[PDB]
Amino acid sequence: MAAGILKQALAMGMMTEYYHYIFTTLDLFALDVEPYRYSGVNMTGFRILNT
Amino acid sequence: MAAGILKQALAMGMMTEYYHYIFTTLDLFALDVEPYRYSGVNMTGFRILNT
């Protein structure tokens, strides 16, 4: 769902330095983040997998 | 070139209601505009082809 909602957020001009998103999911690290890392959004979440 | 520079402008957070782009090209009408019409940017140009 998070991968899906991010695409919609991009389309909507909401992936910028103005927005900060906290993600509840522990599988945050599984998300393709290539489309968003250059934009300046803040995405924070948690990870229990000890990589 | 215009099709190409628009993609870069989107990536850069520059296809929004704040920006107005005038295009010199007469083939403006040939551009896939599906990625940009919902965003609020202003794109204006000319067309000599009498459609």
UniProtKB/Swiss-Prot annotation, chains A, B:
Miscellaneous field: The postsynaptic actions of Glu are mediated by a variety of receptors that are named according to their selective agonists. This receptor binds domoate > kainate > quisqualate > glutamate. It does not bind AMPA without coexpression with GRIK5.
General function of this protein: Ionotropic glutamate receptor that functions as a cation-permeable ligand-gated ion channel, gated by L-glutamate and the glutamatergic agonist kainic acid. L-glutamate acts as an excitatory neurotransmitter at many synapses in the central nervous system. Binding of the excitatory neurotransmitter L-glutamate induces a conformation change, leading to the opening of the cation channel, and thereby converts the chemical signal to an electrical impulse. The receptor then desensitizes rapidly and enters a transient inactive state, characterized by the presence of bound agonist.
Post-translational modification: Sumoylation mediates kainate receptor-mediated endocytosis and regulates synaptic transmission. Sumoylation is enhanced by PIAS3 and desumoylated by SENP1. Ubiquitinated. Ubiquitination regulates the GRIK2 levels at the synapse by leading kainate receptor degradation through proteasome.
Family: Belongs to the glutamate-gated ion channel (TC 1.A.10.1) family. GRIK2 subfamily.
Glycan attachment points: N42
Coiled coil: none
Subunit-level organization: Homotetramer and heterotetramer with GRIK5. Tetramers may be formed by the dimerization of dimers. Assembles into a kainate-gated homomeric channel that does not bind AMPA. Can form functional heteromeric receptors with GRIK4 and GRIK5. Can form functional heteromeric receptors with GRIK3. Interacts with DLG4. Interacts with NETO2. Interacts (via C-terminus) with KLHL17 (via kelch repeats); the interaction targets GRIK2 for degradation via ubiquitin-proteasome pathway.
Section of the entire sequence shown: 234 to 284 of 908
Name of the protein in its database record: Glutamate receptor ionotropic, kainate 2
Species whose genome carries this gene: Rattus norvegicus
Gene name per UniProt: Grik2
Free-text tissue specificity from the UniProt record: Highest expression is found in the olfactory lobe, piriform cortex, dentate gyrus, hippocampus, granular cell layer of the cerebellum, and in caudate-putamen.
Compartment annotation: Cell membrane; Postsynaptic cell membrane
